[PDB]
Every structure is written in structure tokens, then in C-alpha cells.
């Protein structure tokens, strides 16, 4: 019954190693991150 | 049983797995480990165990030669069915390490075995069906590499009726394991693996391809897959040529045999040992560095040792030395930055070994990144956002300028570049930071690097009758950011021709089949100096420097040449800084100031037309 | 004098390779004798190692002591003969101990 339920906010992010130190001839690695509730809409892409 | 294993009961796999023979071979392996020794009488394996324990390592390297000479039968059985005796010898090594070091299980519950010195060598194209499920030693080139993934080792299961956590169950690395009975519920219902209470290990997949050198004419290089586990991950990177000893086996899982068509099976290699077919230093060579630095004439000593395979061009070599050492950056109150990298431009006629200089710099420098304005290059010059060929994920990749931060960027054929790349270099040289606004990403990246470039004049031949500005397609904004402009003219001279010709022909005849510091020490010298030296200035040279600058300004304005501007003074100071650095000293000397004055003044004068150049030669004949 | 030799310069160890296919009971019996000899030599203070190397001075062995020349060069006893290191049988070791008069029979909360 959706009229009497409560929900929250969930979000995904991708984190990449700093491009300066990548080894030559390689593509940089990255990881997936999950955050929720009050840790959503805190950063924007490009931030360190 | 005692060395009666020569009698065979059935196929080798069936024979080896019998318990009594298992104990027999276990004890025999124990005797090998605890009694082997070479002629010298030193405990090879005892010392190996000692170093392993003290270092807190996890694997024993073993020599197939020793094993075969001692207990040949074991070596043959190993070549035939390596799968089982790897486990047997693992337990042997575990108990031996427990005997030496107590409670090693507290830190490591397993010690692996890495075989070595396998006698037979194979190429990836020689494998056939008779080599399946055996020990092989191949050699190839790494072509692609995946990330590191966790793989189950000790799995635990949750019962969903009673919340019981079932105990450890080993994962054999052959198929996934399952359970069907709950000790407390006496049930068989659902189960789920417990992520938090599981112990994993490392997993990686690599692609090997035959080395292009060895393939016979008219055929293609084959390739294979390789599996690395535990501590073998991230040991080799793409482009390195390696030898791998491992177990050759099918992908028995495949997908399924309901597939239509012929029943063909794929194959892989499970790696056991991997081996490739530096700038760190120590006190022993640090005292050596200091001893060499204390010597006089160290500047010429270093300069003479650059690009040994090229004759002459001392100005080129000294410029390369100065830009390869580099100065010291500065920042006044964090509001006025001064760069510390020296920029050199080469401008020469065809057939001058400019590309050879660039290749030598690439091989010698710590962090050198190559690129070109035309041709095939592993990387471009502009930052971008690209899809990943394998992981199918967006990635942000900077150009060679970004990737070579705190390093050197080499550009070949500088004059044939396009609009985007020229803009990128202009930005990097002017600001040392590359902006980017793409795919929702807005940011800036550091690009502090030293640039070395090569080019050719308009028409392929230098016109000494005109100023340098009109001999190239480059524009003044990009030409003024350099500080060492080298111009090479292919003027014809007899003696030079004989010297160069004898050089080249003698090199060729040596290369037919049938003073300078050693390079290995030199690279460490560069690294240590750059890491540990930061020369300073003395306020007693201001009079000399100011008088020189005033004199140059006056003469230049009198002769109506390219203006002399404080950029030249800054370059002089930077070059003197680099010169002082190369001596390992902490202060700048009048000798270094003299050398920097020489270099800068010569570079400026050499780039003028004939009349102006001749006029200035007399004026600045003091140097 | 023998005790001085022992507690100063006697590095010892025991061969773990046997020349007879004994049953588990007899193997355990000789192992118990081995342990008794270990404790006996410990009482006299000679070092007992865990691996053969040229430094060792006595090896104590069950196998034959008259047929070393027939063994392999890689063989431990062959190495001992080459290095002039002293080889004892278990009976010889027991005799030596008896002659030196080493008696073998004898938080929560
Ligand atoms: N002074 C020299 N001494 C020895 N070999 C030289 C010299 N100058 C050129 N060479 C050789 O001649 C050939 C010239 O090609 P290279 O690419 O090295 O020259 P470059 O000056 O970069 O010219 P470009 O790129 O315009 O062809 C190469 O084999 C180079 O090794
Ligand atoms: Mg070239
Ligand atoms: Zn249950």
C-alpha cells in the first residue's frame, strides 16, 4: 500500500584514479560507490 | 613403500591419489626439503625458508634441476600430473615453515610453490592435444590486462530457517561449491553465501601473444589466455616480454554441449611462475655520487656521456643536459609563480639524428612521454572522454602533456600539427594546466612538464638569409615560450664529412653479424640530484648580472635585432640553477653564471640573419 | 674432556632416512629412542640442529655405518664421509651417553 509507506534517496558514483599518475600504455582504473540519505547531492563530476 | 613407486597400478592420476603412496611421496618430499644441499654445503632451502619467514612472504621457489637430480621419479611424475603434488608440496612447505617459525598460521595459512628451470621451452603455436593437463613453460608478450577481482577461498553459508552459519568449506578453484544439509535444522532448504564472513584471494586474466620477432615468415602470431592467482597479480604490465610456467588445461566448463556445430573445446593456461625475460639508490652508491660530484670538470664529464651513438653537436647535447636536469620552481607569497622547467626547440635539416636524440632522451629520463603531430602514436595531445574497449565504461584521459606531469614530453615533427593540438600545447606551456569541459565534467589538470620538440624549416632547407621567425610556420606566441633554440645547418664541409662517414661505416661493420659515466649510474645520478638538490643564489652577483643585461639590451636595440627581454634573464638564472644542481652543490657559482651566459647569448645570436649575426659576433666576442 | 668437546663444539643431528621397511609400531619405537637420545644430548649441551650442513659434527643414524661408499654422492652420509664428520649408530650414541653417565631410563577471569 503506497499511501502509507516511507522511502529514502539512493545514489551511485564512479571514482577514478588521478590521471597524472596512470602508467603509460594503460587505461585508468575506477570503482563504483553507493551513497544514500544525507550523502546525496554533495559533489559534482570533476571534483577531487 | 620406499622408492617402489616405479611400479604402476593404473593411470598416473589414479596411482598418485592412493593414500599410502600419498604418504610415501609426502615423506620423500620432506626428505628432499630437509636433506638437499649443493657442493658448498650451505642449506639452500633452509636459507630460503629463513628469508621467507623473516620477510613474511608466502611462496617458495624451487629448482627443477635439483629436484630431478635428487629424485628424478618425482620430477617425471610432476611433469605428468602436476595438479596433485602441488597440493602435497604445499602441505609439506606449510609444516616445514611451522617447524622453523612457530604459529606462522597466525599470519599466513598457506605457502605456495613456484617451480623454476623447466627444461623444455615451447612457443604458443606448438601446443597440441597431447599437452593437455600437463606442466608447460612458454614465452610470449603481454597484450592486455584486466583488473584484480576477489575469488572465494573459504566460504560460509547462512541457513534461512535457523540463522546458523555453516563452517568453512574449501573452494578448489575448479567449480563452485554447494551444500545441501543444515546441521541444526536437519534440513535441506535454501542457502546463501555470507559475504562478510568469507575469505577471498586475488584473480587476474592476461592475454599472451607470440613475440613478433620469432614467428617464421608468412604466418601470424598466435595468442592464449593466462590466469594469475594470489600474489602473481599486477607483476607484469603490457609491452613486457615474459616467460610463464603453468598448467595447460581445457575450459572443461565451456558453456554447454547443447550448442550446435562441431564439439570444439577452448583452452587456457593456469600460471604457476612468471618471470620477465631502476632509479632507487642506496648509501653505497650515494657515497659514490658524492665522490664523483667532488671531482672537477663534472659538467663536461656529464655532457660527454649523452647520446654516445651520435657524433658532434655539443650544443645540442649540452642543451639536452640542461633541460634534463632542470631548475627549481619558485612562488612568491603564493601569488606569483615562476616555472622551473627549461624548454628546448630543435630546428634542423633532414638527416640530423634529431629523432635519435629524442629516442635517447626517452630511454634515459625517468618519466618521458612520446607523441607526434603525424604518424602512429600510443597517445594524443588533447584531453578527452572515451569509452573503454573492454570494460565498456566512460573514462577521462588527458593528453601526453597531462600524463607527463613532473616529467618530460617529447614531440616529433612539431611543425605539422593541427589546430587543436597547437592550442593544447599553447595552453600547457603558458599556464601548465589543461582545462576540460566535456560530458558534464568541468575541471583542470596539472601539466607541469618539460617539452623537447623537433621540426623542419619551410621547404625542407634552412634559409640563413632570413630571420628564424620566417623560416618556420610557427608563430611568435609559441616560439617565445622556448628558452634554448638550437638551429642545425647541413653546411657541406670535407673534414666533417669524412668524420661522419667513418663513424657510420664503422658502426655498420661492427653491427654486422657473424670518460663518460656509465649509463646505469647516470640515471640514478639524475634521479637523486633532482630529488635532493635545491641550489640558491648569492646577492654578490647582482652587479655582474645587471651590467651584462644592460649591455645586451643596448647592443640589441642598437643593431635592431629581435628584442632582448627579461625572459632571457630569467632563462639565464634558470640555466645557472640547473648547472649548479648538476654539481650537487647547494649554491650557484660565477662559473655557472658564465656558462649560462654563454649558452643563452650564443642561442640568441645564432638565430639572426647573416648581417646581424656577423655584427653581433664582434660585439659579444667577450664570450 | 668429552663433555667439554660436546658443550663447546658438538653440532649434532639425526638421519631421518631409514634402510628398513619397518611397521608403524617399530617406527614409533625407534622414534621414541630418537627422542630419548635427543634429550640425552641436550642434557650434555651439544647443539642439535634441524638440517644437514657442513657445520654439523655428528650425525646419528639407523642405517648401516659400514656401507657409506655404496650411497649416492648427493647422499647425506656420503657428504658426511667426505667432510670427515663423525657418524654414529644409535647403539654407539647410547653407549657414549652411558659412558658419560647420562641416564636415559630415569587469568581465567
Ligand atoms: N650526425 C649524425 N651521426 C650519425 N648518424 C646520423 C647523424 N645524423 C643523422 N644520422 C642518421 O641518419 C638518419 C637520419 O634520420 P633521423 O630521423 O635520425 O634524422 P632527423 O634529423 O630526425 O631527420 P628527419 O626527421 O627530418 O628525417 C638516421 O639513421 C640517423 O641515425
Ligand atoms: Mg626523424
Ligand atoms: Zn538451520
UniProtKB/Swiss-Prot annotation, chain A:
It is found in: Nucleus. It comes from the Eukaryota. Present with 10300 molecules/cell in log phase SD medium. Early fractionation of eukaryotic MCM proteins yielded a variety of dimeric, trimeric and tetrameric complexes with unclear biological significance. The MCM2-7 hexamer is the proposed physiological active complex. Component of the MCM2-7 complex. The complex forms a toroidal hexameric ring with the proposed subunit order MCM2-MCM6-MCM4-MCM7-MCM3-MCM5; loaded onto DNA, forms a head-head double hexamer. Interacts with CSM1. Belongs to the MCM family. Acts as a component of the MCM2-7 complex (MCM complex) which is the putative replicative helicase essential for 'once per cell cycle' DNA replication initiation and elongation in eukaryotic cells. The active ATPase sites in the MCM2-7 ring are formed through the interaction surfaces of two neighboring subunits such that a critical structure of a conserved arginine finger motif is provided in trans relative to the ATP-binding site of the Walker A box of the adjacent subunit. This is Minichromosome maintenance protein 5. The chain holds residues 244 to 291 of 775 of the full protein.
UniProtKB/Swiss-Prot annotation, chain B:
Residues 298-505 form the MCM domain. GO terms for cellular component: CMG complex; cytoplasm; DNA replication preinitiation complex; MCM complex; nuclear pre-replicative complex; nuclear replication fork; nucleoplasm; nucleus. ATP binds at residues 348-355. A zinc finger (C4-type) spans 159-185. One of its GO terms (biological process) is double-strand break repair via break-induced replication. It comes from the Eukaryota. GO terms for molecular function: ATP binding; ATP hydrolysis activity; chromatin binding; DNA replication origin binding; helicase activity; zinc ion binding. It catalyses: ATP + H2O = ADP + phosphate + H(+). Coiled coil: none annotated. Disulfide bonds: none annotated. Its EC number is 3.6.4.12. A motif (Arginine finger) lies at residues 480-483. Keywords: ATP-binding, Cell cycle, DNA replication, DNA-binding, Helicase, Hydrolase, Metal-binding, Nucleotide-binding, Nucleus, Phosphoprotein, Zinc, Zinc-finger. It is found in: Nucleus. It is an enzyme of class 3 (hydrolase). Belongs to the MCM family. Acts as a component of the MCM2-7 complex (MCM complex) which is the putative replicative helicase essential for 'once per cell cycle' DNA replication initiation and elongation in eukaryotic cells. The active ATPase sites in the MCM2-7 ring are formed through the interaction surfaces of two neighboring subunits such that a critical structure of a conserved arginine finger motif is provided in trans relative to the ATP-binding site of the Walker A box of the adjacent subunit. Present with 1690 molecules/cell in log phase SD medium. Early fractionation of eukaryotic MCM proteins yielded a variety of dimeric, trimeric and tetrameric complexes with unclear biological significance. Specifically a MCM467 subcomplex is shown to have in vitro helicase activity which is inhibited by the MCM2 subunit. The MCM2-7 hexamer is the proposed physiological active complex. This is DNA replication licensing factor MCM2. It comes from Saccharomyces cerevisiae (strain ATCC 204508 / S288c) (Baker's yeast). The lineage of its organism: Eukaryota, Fungi, Dikarya, Ascomycota, Saccharomycotina.
UniProtKB/Swiss-Prot annotation, chain C:
Phosphorylated by CDC7 and by CDC5. It comes from the Eukaryota. Induction: Cell cycle-regulated. Protein levels increase as cells begin S phase and remain high through late mitosis. Heterodimer with CDC7 to form the DBF4-dependent kinase (DDK) complex. Interacts (via PBD-binding motif) with CDC5 (via POLO box domains). Interacts (via N-terminus) with ORC2, ORC3 and RAD53. Binds to ARS1 origin DNA. Regulatory subunit of the CDC7-DBF4 kinase, also called DBF4-dependent kinase (DDK), which is involved in cell cycle regulation of premitotic and premeiotic chromosome replication and in chromosome segregation. DDK plays an essential role in initiating DNA replication at replication origins by phosphorylating the MCM2 and MCM4 subunits of the MCM2-7 helicase complex. DBF4 recruits the catalytic subunit CDC7 to MCM2 and to origins of replication. DDK also has postreplicative functions in meiosis. This is DDK kinase regulatory subunit DBF4. It comes from Saccharomyces cerevisiae (strain ATCC 204508 / S288c). The chain holds residues 115 to 262 of 704 of the full protein.
Amino acid at each position: 500500500i503506497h499511501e502509507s509507506s516511507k522511502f529514502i534517496d539512493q545514489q551511485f558514483l564512479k571514482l577514478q584514479e588521478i590521471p597524472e599518475l596512470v602508467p603509460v600504455g594503460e587505461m585508468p582504473r575506477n570503482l563504483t560507490m553507493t551513497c544514500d540519505r544525507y550523502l546525496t547531492n554533495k559533489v559534482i563530476p570533476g571534483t577531487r | 613403500l620406499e622408492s617402489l613407486s616405479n611400479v604402476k597400478a593404473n593411470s598416473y592420476s589414479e596411482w598418485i591419489t592412493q593414500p599410502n603412496v600419498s604418504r610415501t611421496i609426502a615423506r620423500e618430499l620432506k626428505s628432499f626439503l630437509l636433506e638437499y644441499t649443493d657442493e658448498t654445503g650451505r642449506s639452500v632451502y633452509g636459507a630460503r625458508i629463513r628469508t621467507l619467514g623473516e620477510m613474511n612472504s608466502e611462496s617458495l621457489e624451487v629448482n627443477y634441476r635439483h629436484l630431478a637430480e635428487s629424485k628424478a621419479i618425482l620430477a617425471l611424475f610432476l611433469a605428468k600430473c602436476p595438479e596433485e603434488m602441488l597440493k602435497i608440496f604445499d602441505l609439506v612447505a606449510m609444516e616445514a615453515t611451522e617447524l622453523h617459525y612457530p604459529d606462522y598460521a597466525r599470519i599466513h595459512s598457506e605457502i605456495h610453490v613456484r617451480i623454476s628451470d623447466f627444461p623444455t621451452i615451447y612457443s604458443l603455436r606448438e601446443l597440441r592435444e597431447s599437452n593437455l593437463s600437463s606442466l608447460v613453460r612458454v614465452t610470449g608478450v603481454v597484450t592486455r590486462r584486466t583488473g584484480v577481482f576477489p575469488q572465494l577461498k573459504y566460504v560460509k553459508f547462512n541457513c534461512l530457517k535457523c540463522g546458523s552459519i555453516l563452517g568453512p568449506f574449501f573452494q578448489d578453484s575448479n567449480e563452485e561449491i554447494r551444500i545441501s544439509f543444515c546441521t541444526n535444522c536437519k534440513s535441506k532448504g535454501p542457502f546463501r553465501v555470507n559475504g562478510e564472513k568469507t575469505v577471498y584471494r586475488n584473480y587476474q586474466r592476461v592475454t599472451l601473444q607470440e613475440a613478433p620477432g620469432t614467428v617464421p615468415p608468412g604466418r601470424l602470431p598466435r595468442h592464449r589466455e593466462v590466469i594469475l592467482l594470489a600474489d602473481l597479480v599486477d607483476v607484469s604490465k603490457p609491452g613486457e616480454e615474459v616467460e610463464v610456467t603453468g598448467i595447460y588445461k581445457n575450459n572443461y566448463d565451456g558453456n554447454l554441449n547443447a550448442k550446435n556445430g562441431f564439439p570444439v573445446f577452448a583452452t587456457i593456461i593456469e600460471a604457476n611462475s612468471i618471470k620477465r625475460r631502476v632509479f632507487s639508490w642506496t648509501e653505497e652508491e650515494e657515497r659514490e655520487f658524492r665522490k664523483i660530484s667532488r671531482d672537477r670538470g663534472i659538467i663536461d664529464k656529464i655532457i660527454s656521456s649523452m647520446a654516445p651513438s651520435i657524433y658532434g653537436h655539443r650544443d645540442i647535447k649540452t642543451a639536452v643536459a640542461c633541460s634534463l636536469f632542470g631548475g627549481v620552481p619558485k612562488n612568491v607569497n603564493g601569488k606569483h609563480s615562476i616555472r622551473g622547467d627549461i624548454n628546448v626547440l630543435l630546428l634542423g635539416d633532414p638527416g640530423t639524428a634529431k629523432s635519435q636524440i629524442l629516442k635517447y632522451v626517452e630511454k634515459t629520463a625517468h618519466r618521458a612521454v612520446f607523441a607526434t603531430g603525424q604518424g602512429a602514436s600510443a597517445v594524443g595531445l588533447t584531453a578527452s572522454v572515451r569509452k573503454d574497449p573492454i570494460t565498456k565504461e566512460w573514462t577521462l584521459e588527458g593528453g601526453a602533456l597531462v600524463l607527463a606531469d613532473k616529467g618530460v614530453c617529447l614531440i616529433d615533427e612539431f611543425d605539422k600539427m593541427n589546430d587543436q593540438d597547437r592550442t593544447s600545447i599553447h595552453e600547457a606551456m603558458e599556464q601548465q594546466s589543461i582545462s576540460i569541459s566535456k560530458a558534464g565534467i568541468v575541471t583542470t589538470l596539472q601539466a607541469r612538464c618539460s617539452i623537447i620538440a623537433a621540426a623542419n624549416p619551410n621547404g625542407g632547407r634552412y634559409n640563413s638569409t632570413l630571420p628564424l621567425a620566417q623560416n618556420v610556420s610557427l608563430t611568435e606566441p609559441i616560439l617565445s615560450r622556448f628558452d634554448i633554440l638550437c638551429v642545425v645547418r647541413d653546411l657541406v664541409d670535407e673534414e666533417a664529412d669524412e668524420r661522419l662517414a667513418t663513424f657510420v661505416v664503422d658502426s655498420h661493420v661492427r653491427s654486422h653479424p657473424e670518460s663518460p659515466i656509465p649509463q646505469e649510474l647516470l640515471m640514478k645520478y639524475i634521479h637523486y640530484a633532482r630529488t635532493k638538490i635545491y641550489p640558491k643564489l648569492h646577492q654578490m652577483d647582482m652587479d655582474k648580472v645587471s651590467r651584462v643585461y644592460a649591455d645586451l639590451r643596448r647592443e640589441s636595440i642598437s643593431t635592431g635585432s629581435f628584442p632582448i627581454t627579461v625572459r632571457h634573464l630569467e632563462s639565464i638564472l634558470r640555466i645557472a640553477e640547473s648547472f649548479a644542481k648538476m654539481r650537487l652543490s647547494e649554491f650557484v657559482s660565477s662559473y655557472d653564471l658564465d656558462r649560462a651566459i654563454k649558452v643563452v647569448v650564443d642561442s640568441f645570436v645564432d638565430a639572426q640573419k647573416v648581417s646581424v649575426r656577423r655584427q653581433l659576433r664582434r660585439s659579444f666576442a667577450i664570450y | 674432556n668429552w663433555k667439554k668437546i660436546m658443550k663447546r663444539d658438538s653440532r649434532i643431528y639425526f638421519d631421518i632416512t631409514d634402510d628398513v621397511e619397518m611397521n608403524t609400531y617399530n617406527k614409533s619405537k625407534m622414534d621414541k629412542r630418537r627422542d630419548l637420545l635427543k634429550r640425552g644430548f641436550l642434557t650434555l649441551g651439544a647443539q642439535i640442529t634441524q638440517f644437514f650442513d657442513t657445520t654439523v659434527t655428528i650425525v646419528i643414524t639407523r642405517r648401516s655405518v659400514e656401507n657409506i661408499y655404496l650411497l649416492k654422492d648427493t647422499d647425506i652420509l656420503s657428504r658426511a664421509k667426505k667432510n670427515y664428520m663423525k657418524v654414529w649408530s644409535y647403539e654407539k650414541a647410547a653407549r657414549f651417553l652411558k659412558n658419560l653417565d647420562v641416564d636415559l631410563d630415569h587469568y581465567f577471569k
